[PDB]
Amino acid sequence: TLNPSARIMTFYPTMEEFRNFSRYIAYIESQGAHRAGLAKVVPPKEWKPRASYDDIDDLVIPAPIQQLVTGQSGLFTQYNIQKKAMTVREFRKIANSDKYCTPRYSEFEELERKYWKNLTFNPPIYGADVNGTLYEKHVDEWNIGRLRTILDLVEGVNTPYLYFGMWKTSFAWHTEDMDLYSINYLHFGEPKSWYSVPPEHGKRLERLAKGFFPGSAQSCEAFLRHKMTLISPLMLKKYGIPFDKVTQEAGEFMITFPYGYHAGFNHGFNCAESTNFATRRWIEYGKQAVLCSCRKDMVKISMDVFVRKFQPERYKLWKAGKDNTVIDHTLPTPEAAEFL
Numbered sequence: 001t002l003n004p005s006a007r008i009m010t011f012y013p014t015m016e017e018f019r020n021f022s023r024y025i026a027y028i029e030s031q032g033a034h035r036a037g038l039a040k041v042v043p044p045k046e047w048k049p050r051a052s053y054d055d056i057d058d059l060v061i062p063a064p065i066q067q068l069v070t071g072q073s074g075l076f077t078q079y080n081i082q083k084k085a086m087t088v089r090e091f092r093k094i095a096n097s098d099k100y101c102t103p104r105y106s107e108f109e110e111l112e113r114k115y116w117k118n119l120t121f122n123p124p125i126y127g128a129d130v131n132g133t134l135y136e137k138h139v140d141e142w143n144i145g146r147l148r149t150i151l152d153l154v155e156g157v158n159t160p161y162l163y164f165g166m167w168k169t170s171f172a173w174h175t176e177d178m179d180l181y182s183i184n185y186l187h188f189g190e191p192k193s194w195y196s197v198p199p200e201h202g203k204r205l206e207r208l209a210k211g212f213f214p215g216s217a218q219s220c221e222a223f224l225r226h227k228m229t230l231i232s233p234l235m236l237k238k239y240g241i242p243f244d245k246v247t248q249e250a251g252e253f254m255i256t257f258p259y260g261y262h263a264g265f266n267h268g269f270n271c272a273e274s275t276n277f278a279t280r281r282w283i284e285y286g287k288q289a290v291l292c293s294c295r296k297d298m299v300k301i302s303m304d305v306f307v308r309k310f311q312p313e314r315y316k317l318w319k320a321g322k323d324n325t326v327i328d329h330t331l332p333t334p335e336a337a338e339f340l
Ligand SMILES: O=c1[nH]cnc2c(-n3cc(CCN4CCC5(CCc6ccccc65)CC4)cn3)nccc12
Pocket: 128, 129, 156, 161, 163, 170, 171, 176, 177, 182, 184, 192, 262, 272, 297, 298, 299
């Protein structure tokens, strides 16, 4: 009944609302935010995670990736080529050069058309998965480095990663590892555009992708976890896959929800910080997540600790294999009770 449209919702918390992260996640779920699989949270103007970003020029990007894209007719495969380490200074120079800078554009629709028309040409460099934070030590509100969710019970899923983008750099269709939530903050720079498929329609996307990449499907059941498959919004529209789009601007947060498929691209030189987190609602998703058998650096979490603590009644039944729980993607987290 809440957000029946499953459209991306935007939230504007006051400084008071913003102070308790986990409570605010529970609040947005009470509002139906989770149904779209992606939500935007604009922080109060007074909030800043770092005073300035002018001291990061010598920050090392250990493994930049040149993103080679192959395909046609809205279906593409992205291949990553690891390049040697570069500084933020060397990266920003390449990002803003004539070769790699953002093209001239009026409306977003124009930039998006240029993205889908040129993604296979002039492969850009993505300064992705840099272990680190740009948050100052004293920042207690929405600190990606120290979120303090139930995911902390596990103790690279709890650690922050930095992503230095340039025009046309992309993230392929995927859900988070272990079908967890994620938080993404755009520290500075040019926007980041996102596409999302509601969790309730996530199996329709997987079936479509399997139909298009049968070689990839037979090799690995969870082949989208490789984060190599790019599918244009027009292909999604053509095959009746429901989706929504949103542009994230500097100083805004994006939340991805369990089993929320998302993809997107960077408009130009930017920097985003990201991590995974959990709520009590996630435990069932973690228990039922279809994982990637083959690829290296694929995250796996032992669910045992979570079932023992939050589902003790179900522990023996689940470990036995008799746990037949069916996930209702429309239900908010149990923590959302105080708002319902
Ligand atoms: O703007 C974006 N850009 C890039 N990526 C995005 C994105 N996601 C990326 C992942 C995979 C992150 N994951 C971290 C741990 C790794 C880094 C290297 C390593 C080594 C061992 C184990 C794990 C890992 C693998 C990789 C998930 N979501 N979602 C939304 C937005 C973006």
